């Protein structure tokens, strides 16, 4: 019960316009054969081209929407569309490209998938709303066989060259002409009524149809992400490390302690309302304040309405207007003015951030968190939190070479007294590095308007 059995049934109703007469009774085994491939009863780690929803979900970083449309099968030119927004035209003889034979079109397909996937995944998962021409066009740019390794490294092979008779991973595939052991999944097997557009458009206003292949390709992956990460959410699934996940997570813990510790020292709030992750611990355990926790899961769909988060069954609702509210990745429509806020900017370009549904994004760092579209209007009662470092810790090296530090934002006893000590200079530069890691990773920080670092200087006297 791990891999999809080739003897599992495939519903063929979706195929019967491109492929009139298709059997109603069809397995993957007979489908794969009809697509022109031979699985030669092989136990070499590639039991099926098609995969389970669960396997697709574990390999979300690999998803590429794929769609083909008749343009004017062997007779006529095909439009090949990918969720990268690329459209190629193959002949048998937003980016749109002119008609070319399969022998060159297939080279472009390897280049495009390699550049897209090399920093994301060991594989490709073609995500389909299958009507026939996509499945019957794969023989023109795919080869299958036993699992294999790169000729230049230890990564599993994803490409093949007919020039050299060799195999490559995504990193090493320059000049390769065939996709090797792709995976794929037909969204239409999941139990949907009506066409792609009419299902996509229930959930997403951001992707339009121009009746071109890359738009269906984009809409297909959008609808898949909706089904697997918005309506359904499995926070048990771990995902591999592929970048700065560990540094970014550590940065986030450091900045949070810094910012909340400072907020308490500056304005001496008697109560902090900690709204979000129900696992959460006091980020400033030594602080003087009444720490009151409030449970809420990541909203993956729409931002929480502050009205419904606080004052539903307001049967003596807690005084959320007293003290300060901490929303650490707890997304609401409009934050109260007495708030400290970390909010992920869905618009960021990174290897951890994949395009999502209805202007939102899928942030994959240890877990997958689909995140509602970033909206500036959420922050109207707040301001951007300016950078600063604060320490009450004694000046004392205990031991990373030095250039004497000058900064207006180094809030320490030493800088008050004129000259930053070596210890606080190291800590300052380390904290600035963490802070920049975090920001570039896409997190944005916002605070109550009365917040002023000038108030921190009187905590040394
Ligand atoms: C008493 C109580 N039950 S529910 C609740 N909140 C804040 C959540 C909500 N949805 O209103 C409170 C409080 N305080
Ligand atoms: C890294 C992280 N920790 S919890 C979280 N949430 C609540 C997801 C969200 N929907 O905003 C994020 C993000 N991003
Ligand atoms: Zn390699
Ligand atoms: Zn969409
Ligand atoms: Zn110092």
Curated annotation (Swiss-Prot):
Active site: 67, 69, 134, 211, 216
The reaction(s) this protein catalyses: a 5'-end (5'-triphosphoguanosine)-ribonucleoside in mRNA + S-adenosyl-L-methionine = a 5'-end (N(7)-methyl 5'-triphosphoguanosine)-ribonucleoside in mRNA + S-adenosyl-L-homocysteine
Localization (cell): Host cytoplasm; Host endoplasmic reticulum
Sequence ranges assigned to domain ExoN in this UniProt record: 49-230
Positions of Mg(2+) 1 binding: 67, 134
Residues the entry annotates as binding Zn(2+) 16: 395, 414, 421, 424
Outcome, altering residue 19 to V: In strain: Omicron/BA.1, Omicron/BA.2, Omicron/BA.2.12.1, Omicron/BA.2.75, Omicron/BA.4, Omicron/BA.5, Omicron/BQ.1.1, Omicron/XBB.1.5, Omicron/EG.5.1
Sites where the protein binds Zn(2+) 15: 200, 204, 207, 222
Binding residues annotated for S-adenosyl-L-methionine, in chain numbering: 274-280
Positions of the UniProt region annotated as GpppA-binding: 357-371
Residue ranges annotated for the N7-MTase domain, each copy included: 239-461
Amino acids binding Zn(2+) 14: 150, 153, 169, 172
UniProt-annotated binding residues for Mg(2+) 2: 69, 211, 216
Activity regulation behaviour: Inhibited by Remdesivir antiviral drug (GS-5734).
The protein's assembly and partners: Interacts (via N-terminus) with DDX1. Interacts with nsp10.
Function according to Swiss-Prot or TrEMBL: Plays a role in viral RNA synthesis through two distinct activities. The N7-guanine methyltransferase activity plays a role in the formation of the cap structure GpppA-RNA. The proofreading exoribonuclease reduces the sensitivity of the virus to RNA mutagens during replication. This activity acts on both ssRNA and dsRNA in a 3'-5' direction.
Name of the protein: Guanine-N7 methyltransferase nsp14
Source organism of this protein record: Severe acute respiratory syndrome coronavirus 2
Part of the whole protein covered: 5949 to 6449 of 7096
């Amino acid at each position: 019960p791990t891999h999809l059995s080739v003897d599992t049934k495939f519903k063929t109703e979706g195929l019967c316009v491109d492929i009139p007469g298709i059997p109603k009774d069809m397995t993957y085994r007979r489908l794969i054969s009809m697509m022109g491939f031979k699985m030669n009863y092989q136990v070499n780690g590639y039991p099926n081209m098609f995969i389970t929803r669960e396997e697709a979900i574990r390999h979300v970083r690999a998803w590429i929407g794929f769609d083909v449309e008749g343009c004017h099968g062997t007779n006529l030119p095909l439009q090949l569309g990918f969720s990268t927004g690329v459209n190629l035209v193959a002949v048998p003889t937003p980016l749109m490209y002119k008609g070319l034979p399969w022998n060159v079109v297939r080279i472009k397909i390897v280049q495009m998938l390699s550049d897209t996937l090399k920093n994301l995944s060991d594989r490709v998962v073609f995500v389909l709303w299958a009507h026939g021409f996509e499945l019957t066009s794969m023989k023109y740019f795919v080869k299958i066989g036993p699992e294999r390794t790169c000729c230049l490294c230890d990564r599993r092979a994803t490409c093949f060259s007919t020039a050299s008779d060799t195999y490559a991973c995504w990193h090493h595939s320059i000049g390769f002409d065939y996709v090797y052991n792709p995976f794929m999944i037909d969204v239409q097997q999941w139990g949907f009524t009506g066409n792609l557009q009419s299902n996509h458009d229930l959930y997403c206003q951001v992707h339009g149809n121009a009746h071109v292949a890359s738009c269906d390709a984009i809409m297909t992956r959008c609808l898949a992400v909706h089904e697997c990460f918005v309506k359904r959410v499995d926070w048990t699934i771990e995902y591999p490390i592929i970048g700065d996940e560990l540094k970014i997570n550590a940065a986030c813990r450091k900045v949070q302690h810094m910012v909340v510790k400072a907020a308490l020292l500056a304005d001496k709030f008697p109560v902090l309302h900690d709204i979000g992750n129900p696992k959460a611990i006091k980020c400033v355990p030594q602080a003087d304040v009444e720490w009151k926790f409030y449970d809420a899961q990541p909203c993956s769909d729409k931002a929480y309405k502050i009205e419904e988060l606080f004052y539903s069954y307001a049967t003596h609702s807690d005084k959320f207007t007293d003290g300060v509210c901490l929303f650490w990745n707890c997304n609401v429509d409009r934050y109260p003015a007495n708030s400290i806020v970390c909010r992920f900017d869905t618009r960021v370009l990174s290897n951890l951030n994949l395009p999502g549904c209805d202007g939102g994004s899928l942030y994959v760092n240890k877990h997958a968190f689909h995140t509602p579209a970033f909206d500036k209007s959420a922050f109207v009662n707040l301001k951007q939190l300016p950078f600063f470092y604060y320490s009450d810790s004694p000046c004392e090296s205990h031991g990373i070479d030095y250039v004497p530090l000058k900064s207006a934002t180094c809030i320490t006893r030493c800088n008050l007294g004129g000259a930053v000590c070596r210890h606080h200079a190291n800590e300052y530069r380390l904290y600035l590095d963490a802070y920049n890691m975090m920001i570039s990773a896409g997190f944005s920080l916002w605070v109550y308007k009365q917040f002023d670092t000038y108030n921190l200087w009187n905590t040394f006297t």
